[PDB]
Amino acid sequence: GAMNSSNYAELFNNDIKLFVDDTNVYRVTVHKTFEGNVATKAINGCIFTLNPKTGHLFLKIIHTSVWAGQKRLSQLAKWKTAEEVSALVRSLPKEEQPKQIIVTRKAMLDPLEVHMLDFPNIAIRPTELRLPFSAAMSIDKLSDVVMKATEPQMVLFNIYDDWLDRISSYTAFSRLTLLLRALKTNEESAKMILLSDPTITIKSYHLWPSFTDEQWITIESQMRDLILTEYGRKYNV
Amino acid sequence: MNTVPFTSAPIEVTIGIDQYSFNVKENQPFHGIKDIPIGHVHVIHFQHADNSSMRYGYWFDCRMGNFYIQYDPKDGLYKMMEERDGAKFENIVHNFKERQMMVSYPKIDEDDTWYNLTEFVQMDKIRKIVRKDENQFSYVDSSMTTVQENELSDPAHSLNYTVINFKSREAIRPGHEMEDFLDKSYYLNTVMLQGIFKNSSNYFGELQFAFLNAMFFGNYGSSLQWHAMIELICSSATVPKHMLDKLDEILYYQIKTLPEQYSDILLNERVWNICLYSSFQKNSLHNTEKIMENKYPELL
Ligand SMILES: CNC(=O)CN(c1cccc(Cl)c1)S(C)(=O)=O
Ligand SMILES: CNC(=O)CN(c1cccc(Cl)c1)S(C)(=O)=O
Ligand SMILES: CNC(=O)CN(c1cccc(Cl)c1)S(C)(=O)=O
Ligand SMILES: CNC(=O)CN(c1cccc(Cl)c1)S(C)(=O)=O
């Protein structure tokens, strides 16, 4: 069944599961042609496949060459996503394979179910949650590896850095979703908040700054304020 | 012309014989149906007046034996039987005919409805869907489930229609996932037609039988099968022209015959709107699209 507020804690139990977000697989810039028509130019994209218990992000970079000579690219992108997720599952040892894959967009259900027919015991589930994983390309280091890729590539990231040494998975996912929601609502403000204190550096192998517990509380408050601020700017409240 | 004689009519019942229905009163001088056209399968069906939940019937072909209906007061239904003694049976039928104790199959000469609904239906194939090998006729009722329904509970009493499942390894070649899911031609032409059914006549025969079972008994499993077999064709980009033209004729006569008051339950909105307006064959079913739009424009 669908994952929602009511069964949210299931994300942090000991059954291996992956979220799959396809928002950033097929990405384009729209531009005018010399004749005054409109055309698109693809740019590199990525599949965002995340284990919410452990922070493991299997970031499959989608290089623009995969679209060459293909038609109906927005449809193909869902199938290519499902093809790559299926390939990842097959590449993992049996004891690492997920028991459930949760897709962030319902249009991924049939493509993924069809690609996973060999795995009848892996549940393919939608969600009622509005998750902000499209903003993954606002994390500078992730955007950089995607944009520099010259061929298809899988890049591995822990999206929680070392937070799980100090906090639980539930708290780590909440922090991640707050940060991504903030970056989605006002990317400039959010990045200003995260980088207002340059003394707090991002480790070479990390994605986010090395905040202390107390600093994370302040940061999280500043992100909540940003989200409420933008909500008032949008709705004139 | 052939005859299905009856013991009597001890309980009040609506009797169907193909697309006709008539009422018989409790203990009325009713001994059967004569003038049944040779060359087609037929169905004789029943709805008891005192229990509308009792809807059952028998598919038969009079070329395969002499059949009679006898009420069984223990099992509470009209049963079809076979009389092996031809002489005795011909004499029994002659006596009833002389006494004008039989109704006459009311086929209009201009009318090809029954042929058109049963063109590809063969008793031998019916007997593989409905397995009861000791009889030459086949019992079907409202409640009998299909093999596919049972997979998702008595096997000997099931409708063994060919299982069609669009999200199954049978339907989807490894490495052609998107291709095979969006264009079902492989599954229609190689898996089903070449592999299982052998030819389109057998495919259409099962499609026609499923429709008739759904329409005569309110058999949900048959309704599911009829629509699945339509959708498999309509969702294939590559279908022989003769099959498309025949499918249009098949469906036209099915839609024409359907009781108007049962359209809401017998026609799946999704399948029909998909098939007539979105599918690869949306422009290949002219006669069917015309009758649907003029008879059931609401559903669309
Ligand atoms: C360990 N190698 C890494 O690159 C980083 N990590 C990881 C991330 C994603 C998937 C996998 Cl399988 C491992 S980890 C284990 O350090 O958190
Ligand atoms: C009371 N049981 C019956 O009459 C059954 N019989 C029969 C056979 C063929 C047709 C009819 Cl209609 C009746 S018989 C032979 O016993 O007379
Ligand atoms: C006029 N009422 C009727 O039932 C007439 N009809 C009919 C009657 C008795 C037996 C049979 Cl087989 C049919 S019919 C042909 O219109 O369906
Ligand atoms: C789920 N419905 C059932 O099992 C029985 N019904 C039905 C519904 C749609 C098509 C068909 Cl053939 C039958 S009925 C007769 O009650 O309307």
Curated annotation (Swiss-Prot), chain A:
Impact reported for T23A: Reduced growth at 30 degrees Celsius. Strongly reduced growth at 16 degrees Celsius
Coiled coil: none
Signal peptide coordinates: none
UniProt-reported outcome of changing D22A: Reduced growth at 30 degrees Celsius. Strongly reduced growth at 16 degrees Celsius. Strongly reduced growth at 35 degrees Celsius
Effect of D21A: Alters protein folding. Severely impaired growth. Strongly reduced growth at 35 degrees Celsius
Region of interest: RNase H homology domain: 7-237
Record localization: Nucleus
Subunit structure: Component of the U4/U6-U5 tri-snRNP complex composed of the U4, U6 and U5 snRNAs and at least PRP3, PRP4, PRP6, PRP8, PRP18, PRP31, PRP38, SNU13, SNU23, SNU66, SNU114, SPP381, SMB1, SMD1, SMD2, SMD3, SMX2, SMX3, LSM2, LSM3, LSM4, LSM5, LSM6, LSM7, LSM8, BRR2 and DIB1.
Other comment: Present with 468 molecules/cell in log phase SD medium.
Record comment regarding domains: The MPN (JAB/Mov34) domain has structural similarity with deubiquitinating enzymes, but lacks the residues that would bind the catalytic metal ion. Contains a region with structural similarity to reverse transcriptase, presenting the classical thumb, fingers and palm architecture, but lacks enzyme activity, since the essential metal-binding residues are not conserved.
The protein's role, per its UniProt record: Functions as a scaffold that mediates the ordered assembly of spliceosomal proteins and snRNAs. Required for association of BRR2 with the spliceosomal U5 snRNP, and the subsequent assembly of the U4/U6-U5 tri-snRNP complex. Functions as a scaffold that positions spliceosomal U2, U5 and U6 snRNAs at splice sites on pre-mRNA substrates, so that splicing can occur. Interacts with both the 5' and the 3' splice site, as well as the branch region. Has a role in branch site-3' splice site selection. Associates with the branch site-3' splice 3'-exon region. Also has a role in cell cycle.
Protein name: Pre-mRNA-splicing factor 8
Organism, scientific name: Saccharomyces cerevisiae (strain ATCC 204508 / S288c) (Baker's yeast)
From Swiss-Prot, chain B:
Residue ranges, annotated region (Leucine-zipper): 244-265
UniProt KW Phosphoprotein keyword: yes
Gene Ontology, cellular component aspect: cytoplasm; U5 snRNP
Chief place where the protein resides: cytoplasm
GO biological-process terms attached to the record: spliceosomal snRNP assembly; spliceosomal tri-snRNP complex assembly
Keyword tags: Cytoplasm, mRNA processing, mRNA splicing, Nucleus, Phosphoprotein
Domain of life: Eukaryota
Compartmental location: Cytoplasm; Nucleus
Variant or mutagenesis effect after changing S236 to D/E: Disrupts interaction with PRP8
Any Pfam family: AAR2_1st
PTM: Phosphorylated on serine and tyrosine residues.
Matching InterPro entries: AAR2, AAR2_C, AAR2_C_sf, Aar2_N, AAR2_N_sf
Modified residues (Phosphothreonine): T257
Residues found modified as Phosphoserine: S236
Protein family according to the UniProt entry: Belongs to the AAR2 family.
Quaternary structure and interacting proteins, as annotated: Heterodimer. Interacts with PRP8 (via RNase H homology domain and MPN domain), competing with BRR2 for the same binding site. Component of a U5 snRNP complex that contains at least the U5 snRNA, PRP8, SNU114, AAR2, SMB1, SMD1, SMD2, SMD3, SME1, SMX2 and SMX3, but is not a component of the U4/U6-U5 tri-snRNP complex.
Annotated function: Component of the U5 snRNP complex that is required for spliceosome assembly and for pre-mRNA splicing. Involved in splicing pre-mRNA of the A1 cistron and other genes that are important for cell growth.
Note: Present with 7330 molecules/cell in log phase SD medium.
Protein name per its UniProtKB record: A1 cistron-splicing factor AAR2
Record organism: Saccharomyces cerevisiae (strain ATCC 204508 / S288c) (Baker's yeast)
Lineage summary: Eukaryota, Fungi, Dikarya, Ascomycota, Saccharomycotina
